[PDB]
Ligand binder design. Sequence first.
Ligand code: HEC
Length: 104
Amino acid sequence: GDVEKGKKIFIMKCSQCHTVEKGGKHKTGPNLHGLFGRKTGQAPGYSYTAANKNKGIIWGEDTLMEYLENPKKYIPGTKMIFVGIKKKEERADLIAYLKKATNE
Ligand code: HEC
């Protein structure tokens, strides 16, 4: 659950658009502050993707490990430009970091 690594990653992996900082902006990507344990297409006043609502799942440790793996797949029509991840520990750490960031 490397938090230091996930930091460098997110920094230039997701953070690029996302924002693990309460009060984030609806930039290229939505905020990621408490995304764990909440429904999708919730961010009010956002231009979410037609696939962001379509899915309509409960984000978490699984939905992620699965989603992250393939964002395009999971969300067909998502703007989230991301190839995906493979390394388990990579997703386990990256996710961990968040658990310390969003869930600091
Ligand atoms: C900007 C180019 C992005 C990058 C890089 C990443 N994400 Fe993203 N994400 C982006 C958008 C515009 C959206 C909405 C469209 C959709 O339905 O996906 C998302 C959505 C997600 C979601 C779902 C809702 C939410 O969490 O806010 C998750 C769980 C998510 N994205 C996670 C995530 C992670 C961990 C990334 C790097 C590993 C990542 N995103 C990259 C835009 C962008």
